[PDB]
Design a protein around this nucleic acid. Structure first.
Length: 214
RNA sequence: GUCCCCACG
RNA sequence: GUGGGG
C-alpha cells in the first residue's frame, strides 16, 4: 500500500520565517517536519525535499515528498503559497526511460581517517550517482558522448545549528550537487523503494529527493 | 575545505 | 571503505 505525497510550496520572501528557512536548510527541515510530525514520531515516514532558490522573476520553490499525508494547516500564511498536496503511485516498468532531477551529496568515507568527505571531481560525482542508482534499481542512460547526466550546480553547504538556547552549535558541512538527466528503470520494486527512501546523505538538509518524470 | 551519531551479513 | 540518521 504505497503512495508518496508531493507538495509544492512557493515561499514568500516578505516573510521572516521563510527567509530564515531559505538561508538555513536545518531550519527549513524543522518547518516541513511539522506537516508530518505525528507520522515522523511513528517511525515509517521519510521526509524529503528540494529547494529551487529564487532567480530573476522566479520565487523560491520547495518540492516536498512525504510517505504519509501532510497537514500544511500548521504553517502560517505569509510563509508560503501551498499547492494542494497530491498522492502519487508511480507505475514503473523494466526498460522504461525517465528524466530525473536530484540534489545529492556524492561522498566517501576515507579509510585512513574515517571522515566522510566530498568526492572532488565531476567524474567521481557521476561514478557515485551511477552506483547508488544501480543498487537502487535504475541505470543511467548512456548517450553518444557520455552518460545522460549533467551537473547543473555544485555547492558546499555549511549550516550552523544553534545549541543550549542561543549558543553556537555544530557546523554541518555537506557538498551539494544538482544532477539532471535521463535513466532506465531496471528493477521496478527497487526503483520504487529508491524513490520513497531517497539517495545519499543530507536528507534532512534538502538532499536525496530523486524526482523522475516521462 | 565533513561538525556529529548508528551499523558493519 | 559501504550505507543509514542529524
Amino acid at each position: 500500500y504505497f503512495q508518496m505525497w508531493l507538495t509544492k510550496l512557493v515561499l514568500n520572501p516578505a516573510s521572516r520565517a521563510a527567509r530564515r528557512d531559505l538561508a538555513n536548510p536545518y531550519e527549513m527541515h524543522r518547518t516541513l517536519s511539522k506537516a508530518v510530525s505525528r507520522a515522523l514520531e511513528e517511525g515509517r515516514e521519510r521526509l524529503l525535499w528540494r529547494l529551487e532558490p529564487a532567480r530573476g522573476l522566479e520565487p523560491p520553490v520547495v518540492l516536498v515528498q512525504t510517505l504519509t499525508e501532510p497537514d500544511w494547516s500548521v504553517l502560517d500564511e505569509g510563509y508560503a503559497q501551498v499547492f494542494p498536496p497530491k498522492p502519487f503511485h508511480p507505475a514503473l516498468k523494466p526498460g522504461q526511460r525517465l528524466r530525473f532531477r536530484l540534489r545529492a551529496n556524492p561522498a566517501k568515507r576515507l579509510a585512513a581517517t574515517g571522515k566522510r568527505v566530498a568526492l572532488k571531481t565531476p567524474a567521481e560525482k557521476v561514478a557515485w550517482l551511477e552506483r547508488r542508482l544501480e543498487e537502487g534499481g535504475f541505470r543511467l542512460l548512456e548517450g553518444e558522448r557520455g552518460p545522460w547526466v549533467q551537473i547543473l550546480q555544485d555547492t558546499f553547504l555549511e549550516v550552523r545549528r544553534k545549541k543550549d538556547g542561543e549558543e553556537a552549535g555544530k557546523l554541518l558541512q555537506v557538498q551539494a550537487v544538482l544532477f539532471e538527466g535521463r535513466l532506465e528503470v531496471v528493477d521496478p520494486e527497487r526503483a520504487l523503494a529508491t524513490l520513497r527512501r531517497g539517495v545519499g546523505p543530507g536528507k534532512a538538509l534538502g538532499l536525496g529527493l530523486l524526482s523522475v518524470a516521462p
